[PDB]
Ligand binder design. Structure first.
Ligand SMILES: [Mg+2]
Ligand SMILES: [Mg+2]
Ligand SMILES: [Mg+2]
Ligand SMILES: [Mg+2]
Ligand SMILES: [Zn+2]
Lengths: 214, 154, 181, 127, 81
RNA sequence: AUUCAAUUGUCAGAGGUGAAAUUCUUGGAUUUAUUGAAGACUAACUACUGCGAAAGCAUUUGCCAAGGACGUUUUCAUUAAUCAAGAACGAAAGUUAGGGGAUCGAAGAUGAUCAGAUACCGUCGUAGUCUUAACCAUAAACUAUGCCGACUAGGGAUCGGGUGGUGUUUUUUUAAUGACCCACUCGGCACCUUACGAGAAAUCAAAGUCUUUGGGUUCUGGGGGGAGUAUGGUCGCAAGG
RNA sequence: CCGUAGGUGAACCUGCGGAAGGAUCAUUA
């Protein structure tokens, strides 16, 4: 009988201060009667948006970024980093039938006490002088590149915290380090970290999250 | 269930003339060492005396219910012959601890000890007891377990 | 009040894209009144609209459907049929989704849906008002639901390993009470 | 500027779901099935039922005032097929036809790395 | 190719084929007379030396075994035979 | 990914279908979102391919021993080739006794239906599927082609190794390599043309070097059924071989 | 069709693993 549209209350979320365009997203809570229940309802909310729409670039640069809401500031919501992914059609186009695919994985504890998982993908190029219609790589080559990706990813995430991880995700510094550090092993193409998982969340802080907002 | 309708009715008749399919008539007249042997063979061979006349493919078979009915409960005997006849080629010990057979059997046992009030231990069968091993003890206690379903008599 | 969609260009079809693009764009630009921009480097096609164009919001979805059609092997006469009609839609399906086949079993299933000189493929386009393109492991049928539904029944007969003669008999049966009604 | 919605299209062989809420899956706004819009059981997954159902979802989104919307489309996924059926395509045609603004179109189908056994057996499942 | 000399092949095409498929079987190896500059002495090293041959006075690895041919040390001279 | 559990939102369906029908949904079903648990599995990358005696073998990393190929102005000097007896392995399904039992699912329980286009369909589902200890020894176990040795055609490739290049690229300042190119070279997986030759023909670099009939050796067949039956022996708990 | 297992059956169906002794069109490098 009663309409929930008469009851529900229009809220709003905002990005942290790492990114450029803060004004994204408009969320919603059924009831404002119990504020603790509303706060616990928005605590488990994970908003997935495009990174390019979050960065305002008109080219939709195939990266979805998914973000977790934590704190309330008067119908406005603080939002924290949770993870990154691609669109699945990017992976469907992206896998070639005549090259060798490398998956590299590393288990990560961070400097800011997060537990993380990083999946990086590398490939095999044609050179500018090729006659071969296929460019496969030997297994010892593949093991060497996987060793190099594990070392670069491990030292890169250990030398930095979450804000620097996000600040090095956007200009593709990490795969540039891969490109010039693996150029002595094999020619590599189309390198990106595909997908970011949080695994452990530490003891909940307050001032660090508004410092990320500030 | 074709012979089940005329095995347990009140006021049993004099004779029973009927035509069925011939292979069920082989199941009512199956020797215990056969692959044609089944549960319904035992059901007729100690509840309903039966022989084959008038081969017709179909078969006529003649049934007579024993008016001194032997005091055997049909539910427990039917259930045990079902759970050892479905696993005909298997043996009997490991076949009872199946997945859900090993729930419904001790449900039947707990209703069986509901009027007995036997204390169910914390030892209960995963190592040496009534859900797992005392079943093996009581099939060792009788003529079953190692002798398969195509060898055990009444 | 602009709107742009982004779509992916296969590598197997970019050479007929640059071969017959001169026949692709002016019918949709003239009759359907849209704007197209390429990105040949990043395999992307920009289908954009403008308030200086005609107000027709569904034909932008239709134009993305034409390039989604051309993504999956489809010629230009089926693009003319997709221009003129609305009941005609697109489908993919996998060889492994009916029956788990491997290698030469997959090759013989592709041979069964293909046939000698494509004749069972010809028999399934002409009798059902469908259009057939075979990928490595994908089957593609255009059309309406009464048409593509009996196309489904035929192709899951054929990829199950039923002989093509029973396919022809059931095909002319369903075509007979198709054109009967 | 505007408010974007988060749309879901679930395309089986036998119905279609057009199901939308706001960001992060907070509380569902509009909710239709294929069975409620045509009472004929042969036409549960018809494109006519798909367009009328998505038109009623668009009317619901217009009366709550959401203009922009972001959509992902999917099949059942898993052991069954990957790309959506044509009821989803007609739903896309209807939501674009409705005059509602569209934000993003992608394919979040739940794709296994390595699947389990399907429900057909060795021989096959379809007819 | 009905007629050709199997007795006197052309020497450009004769060492062009395999080691064992010649008219008389010959090796395709040689010996290297190596001079590391630090001690100035003649050491005769096989071209496919399959072990770490050091110099007899300095502990300099003259050649390392790498598959077919042994790679010589850098900044180090060599002669045939 | 699937299934199940917990939390979350919302309202008449979800399910399955030539078609319907059963199943469970105010204790809010399907679906949406946040987690957790279980066991299998290793997709796309995947062929123009790799390894192993065969069956078979696709995540990453570490350890354990093994193997082919190549290089070798190393070592032994006939130590070899084929195989009754005997022995090792042997897909799936099956068998014993354990652990696990997510999905699938012969048996069974259930619904059906409506027609001679027709029951394939559904929902629970036990065994099993997975693993450990021991059995079992069969397949369209197929290249429907015994093993070793020599000769009789090339070329486009490719995989592993090696040789050479005042060859390319990768720069840092020239190298070094790594990757790529060329000319080869062995040793594998394959292709395309022929016919000298074979065959009944399809076709074949072996199915040729066979009436101009002999490189060495192991097994099998003698019109079709009766029949892999009877019987005897042998192994196996049995199914069975 | 073959192997194995099961319900049966007047025939025959079903579970798991194999084989083609079964019919590659179009497109591209
Ligand atoms: Mg022998
Ligand atoms: Mg045999
Ligand atoms: Mg004879
Ligand atoms: Mg024959
Ligand atoms: Zn020296």
């Amino acid at each position: 009988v009663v309409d929930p549209f008469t009851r529900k209350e229009w809220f709003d979320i905002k990005a942290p201060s790492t990114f450029e365009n803060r004004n994204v997203g408009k969320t919603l809570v059924n009831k404002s009667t119990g504020l603790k229940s509303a706060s616990d309802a928005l605590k488990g909310r994970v908003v997935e948006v495009c990174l390019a729409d979050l960065q305002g670039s008109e080219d939709h640069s195939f990266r979805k970024i998914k973000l977790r809401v934590d704190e309330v500031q008067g119908k406005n919501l603080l939002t924290n980093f949770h993870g990154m992914d691609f669109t699945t059609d990017k992976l469907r186009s992206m896998v070639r039938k005549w090259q060798t695919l490398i998956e590299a994985n590393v288990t990560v504890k961070t400097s800011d006490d997060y537990v993380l998982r990083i999946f990086a993908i590398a490939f095999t190029r044609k050179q500018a002088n090729q006659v071969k219609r296929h460019s496969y790589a030997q297994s010892s080559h593949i093991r060497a590149i996987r060793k190099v990706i594990s070392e670069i990813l491990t030292k890169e995430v250990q030398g930095s915290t979450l804000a620097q991880l996000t600040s090095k995700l956007i200009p593709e510094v990490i795969n540039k380090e891969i490109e010039n550090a693996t150029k002595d092993i094999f020619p590599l193409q189309n390198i990106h970290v595909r997908k970011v998982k949080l695994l452990k969340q530490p003891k909940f802080d307050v001032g660090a999250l508004m410092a990320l907002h500030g | 269930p074709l012979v089940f309708k005329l095995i347990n009715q009140p006021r049993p008749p004099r004779v029973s003339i009927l035509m069925f399919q011939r292979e069920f008539a082989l199941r009512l007249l199956a020797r215990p060492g056969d692959s044609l042997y089944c549960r319904l063979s035992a059901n007729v061979q100690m509840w309903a005396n039966v022989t084959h006349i008038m081969k017709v493919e179909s078969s006529v078979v003649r049934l007579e219910i024993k008016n001194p009915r032997p005091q055997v409960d049909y539910n427990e005997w039917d259930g045990l012959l079902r759970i050892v006849f479905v696993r005909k080629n298997r043996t009997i010990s490991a076949g009872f601890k199946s997945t859900t057979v090993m729930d419904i059997l001790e449900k039947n046992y707990k209703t069986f000890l509901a009027m007995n009030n036997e204390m169910v231990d914390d030892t209960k069968g995963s190592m040496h007891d009534v859900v797992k091993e005392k079943i093996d003890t009581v099939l060792k206690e009788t003529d079953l377990g190692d002798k398969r379903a195509g060898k055990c008599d009444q | 009040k602009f709107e742009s969609r982004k779509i992916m260009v296969p590598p197997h079809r970019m050479t007929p894209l640059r071969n017959s693009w001169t026949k692709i764009y002016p019918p949709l630009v003239e009759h359907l009144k849209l704007q197209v921009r390429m990105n040949l480097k990043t395999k992307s096609v920009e289908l954009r609209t403008n308030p200086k164009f005609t107000t027709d919001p569904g034909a932008l979805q239709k134009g993305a459907d034409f390039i989604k059609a051309f993504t999956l092997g489809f010629d230009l006469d089926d693009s003319i049929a997709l221009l003129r009609l609305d009941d005609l839609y697109i489908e993919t399906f996998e060889v492994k989704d009916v029956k788990t086949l491997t290698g030469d079993h997959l090759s013989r299933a592709i041979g069964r849906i293909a046939g000698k000189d494509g004749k069972t493929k010809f028999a399934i386009e002409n009798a059902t008002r469908t259009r057939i393109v075979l990928a490595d492991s994908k089957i593609h049928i255009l059309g309406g639901f009464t048409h593509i539904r009996m196309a489904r029944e035929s192709v899951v007969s054929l990829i199950l390993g039923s002989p093509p003669g029973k396919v022809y008999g059931n095909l002319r049966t369903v075509a007979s009470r198709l054109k009967e009604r | 500027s505007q408010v974007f919605g988060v749309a879901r299209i679930y395309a089986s062989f036998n119905d279609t779901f057009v199901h939308v809420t706001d960001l992060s899956g907070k509380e569902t706004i509009a909710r239709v099935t294929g069975g409620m819009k045509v009472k004929a059981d042969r036409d549960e997954s018809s494109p006519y039922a798909a367009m009328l159902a998505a038109q009623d979802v668009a009317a619901k989104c217009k009366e709550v005032g959401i203009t922009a919307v972001h959509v992902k489309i999917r099949a059942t996924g898993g052991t069954r097929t990957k790309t959506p059926g044509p009821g989803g395509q007609a739903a896309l045609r209807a939501l674009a036809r409705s005059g509602l603004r569209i934000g993003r179109i992608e394919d979040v189908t739940p794709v296994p790395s390595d699947s389990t056994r399907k429900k057909g057996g060795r021989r096959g499942r379809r007819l | 190719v009905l007629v050709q000399d199997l007795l006197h092949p052309t020497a450009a095409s004769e060492a062009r084929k395999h080691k064992l498929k010649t008219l008389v079987q010959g090796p395709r190896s040689y010996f290297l007379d190596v001079k590391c500059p630090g001690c100035l002495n003649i050491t005769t090293v096989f071209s496919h030396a399959q072990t770490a041959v050091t110099c007899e006075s300095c502990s300099t690895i003259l050649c390392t075994p790498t598959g077919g041919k042994a790679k010589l040390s850098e900044g180090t001279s060599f002669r045939r035979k």
